[PDB]
Structure 1
Amino acid sequence: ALLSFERKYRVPGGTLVGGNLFDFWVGPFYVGFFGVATFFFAALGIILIAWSAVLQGTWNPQLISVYPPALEYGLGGAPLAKGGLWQIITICATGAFVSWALREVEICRKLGIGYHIPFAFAFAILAYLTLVLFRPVMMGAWGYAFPYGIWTHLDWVSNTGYTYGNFHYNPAHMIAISFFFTNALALALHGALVLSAANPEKGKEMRTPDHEDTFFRDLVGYSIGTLGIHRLGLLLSLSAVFFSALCMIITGTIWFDQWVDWWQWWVKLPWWANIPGGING
């Protein structure tokens, strides 16, 4: 089925591969070459996970967990039951994520819109790849990656973090968190402002963008504007993910000790390092 204004858009063209071979829909979903590639990768991956469940002896979603090769295997391959299955599944996940993005690009071309979305999504993929590929490799072993399990991956987060004391002290981690918080703050602000203008007090006429600029100008003395707010939302989100990847990529590669100790560089600055008094005096 189509939306009442859809027909005119379901036109041929836009694909990056296969000409018109896969240029069609199924219900509301567009397919395309990368539509079938995604399906392939996702299916194989899910299948390999179900097989790993069997070798584990469970069907419980809360218990199923696929672990990567133990540190002993370095960056080499491993037995399908001891890290190898995770390795294949990781290839399928990557293949499925990238294909999903490329499918989004074909959809952009067919509709004549910008490519911002798949571009944004790439940031997510690059964050995944940092934890499962770039950091493990730089560190020298696939064992450093996280396991695929609903609760087991949280254990990995906990153990990984505490290996460096309280991870809060990771400077890049602090910046990333600020971006996540500010993003949620901005998202709430944008949603409320548009809605407050489109849904004024009962019985009144729809407010205008002018009312939106005025409301915030009155409130904090500044209005970013209807174009800027969207620009900001995209920037904060990507910056949050960008710094997430950065705070991890550097941990265990150029920083090894307790993160809290890193801040000594500031306290040990020559001009005040030895002055008595205070917390560090």
Structure 2
Amino acid sequence: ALLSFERKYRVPGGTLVGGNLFDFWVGPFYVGFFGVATFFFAALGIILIAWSAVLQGTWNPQLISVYPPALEYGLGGAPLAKGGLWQIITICATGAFVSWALREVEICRKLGIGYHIPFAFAFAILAYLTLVLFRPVMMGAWGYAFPYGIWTHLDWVSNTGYTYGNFHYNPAHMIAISFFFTNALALALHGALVLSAANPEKGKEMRTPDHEDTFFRDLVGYSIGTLGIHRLGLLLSLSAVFFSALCMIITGTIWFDQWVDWWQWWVKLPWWANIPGGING
């Protein structure tokens, strides 16, 4: 049940709520007040989903799908069978995510390390909240949120995207994709670098961070460093999700026309707006 070097860290303290009432582990899992909180929200939410499965007539994972209330209902309550379960489950989901982050904070205090992880996680929770709460409220109806279903939610993406033409033209969607692409590139390099140093040519001796820095300067003429690479990855990640939430928060709110047309502000600038020739003339 314990890692060879674990006992020394399993000391009392660090809890945010309830003192030492829930200060304990179950197997490897820590259980704070929030350990209990998330279980409560998750059990409930899984129950409501099972119950929504019956009302629908399937027990097939590829088929089950909880839909939000129809547009007619605007931002109000709705019958369980027609958008209500979705609303309650959304609350439970939100309760389960926020609790998990808070539980991570408590684990951070007991171990005496920084709070970067719970902090990073918050960005994901935020993207989720933009889709099921922020955008819908700003648009006037819970009907704009995505349905909870393995394929039905991809339908939402597809349809919502095509509602504004080729979504590729959303400018904030371009930034977002760039960060996602870049973060993967960066992750591939970081993992390969450290590994090629710890596992040098057959029989040779373990390389050093000096070699790591050398390899990169040789290659591209610059090395961000061991501390820099981790600051970078964290940043590329959080930025990718930040621009994602952002490209959506503006779609259907301050901009509801074709995204491709948004680009005329540039082509139609006074100066070149009239010159003949080119693609736009």
TM-score, normalised to structure 2's length?
1.00
How far 1:100 moved relative to its partner? 0.3
SS of structure 1 residue aligned to 2:273: coil
Q: CA deviation at 1:142?
A: 0.1
SS at match of 1:271: helix
Gaps (5+ residues) in structure 2?
none
- How far the C-alpha of 1:174 sits from its partner, in A, is 0.2
Provide the C-alpha distance between the structure 2 equivalents of 1:78 and 1:54, rounded to a whole number of angstroms.
18
The whole-number CA distance in structure 2 between the counterparts of 1:268 and 1:112 is: 57
Measure how far apart 1:113 and its partner are: 0.2
C-alpha displacement at 1:267, in angstroms? Answer: 0.3
Percentage of identical aligned residues? 100
RMSD in angstroms over aligned alpha carbons? 0.3
* Whole-angstrom distance in 1 between the partners of 2:196 and 2:119: 31
Instruction: Report the CA distance between 1:187 and its aligned residue.
Output: 0.2
Deviations 1:75-113 (A, max 9, x none): 000000000000000000000000000000000000000
How many angstroms does 1:195 deviate by?
A: 0.1
Partners of 2:203 and 2:166 in 1: how far apart? 54
Instruction: Give, in whole Å, the separation in 2 of the partners of 1:188 and 1:17.
Output: 40
Q: Does 1:155 align with 2:149?
A: no
For residues 122-171 of structure 1, the C-alpha deviation after alignment (integer angstroms, 9 at most, x for no partner) is 00000000000000000000000000000000000000000000000000
Q: CA deviation at 1:37?
A: 0.2
Mapped pair 1:99 → 2:95? no
Secondary structure of 1:148's aligned partner: coil
Q: Kindly provide the CA deviation profile for residues 249-274 of structure 1, in whole angstroms up to 9, marking residues without a partner as x.
A: 00000001100000000101111000
State the alpha-carbon separation in 2 of the partners of residues 242 and 170 from structure 1: 15
Partner SS state of residue 272, structure 1: helix
Stretches of structure 1 that go unaligned for 5 or more consecutive residues are: none
Give secondary structure in 1 for the equivalent of 2:269: coil
SS in 1 for 2:132: helix
Aligned residues: 281
Deviation at 1:42, TM superposition (A): 0.6
Residue 246 of structure 1 and its aligned partner are, at CA, apart by: 0.2
Q: Distance in 1 between matches of 2:6 and 2:271?
A: 68
Q: Alpha-carbon deviation of 1:50?
A: 0.4
d(CA) in 2 for partners of 1:38, 1:247: 30
Report the alpha carbon displacement of residue 176 of structure 1 after superposing the two structures with TM.
0.1
How far apart in 2 are the matches of 1:23 and 1:46? Answer: 26
What's the CA shift for 1:74?
A: 0.1
- How far the C-alpha of 1:238 sits from its partner, in A, is 0.4
Q: Please report how far the alpha carbon of residue 60 of structure 1 lies from its aligned counterpart in structure 2 after TM superposition.
A: 0.1
Length-normalised TM-score, structure 1: 1.00
CA deviations over 1:215-238 (Å, ceiling 9, x no partner)? 000000000000000000000000
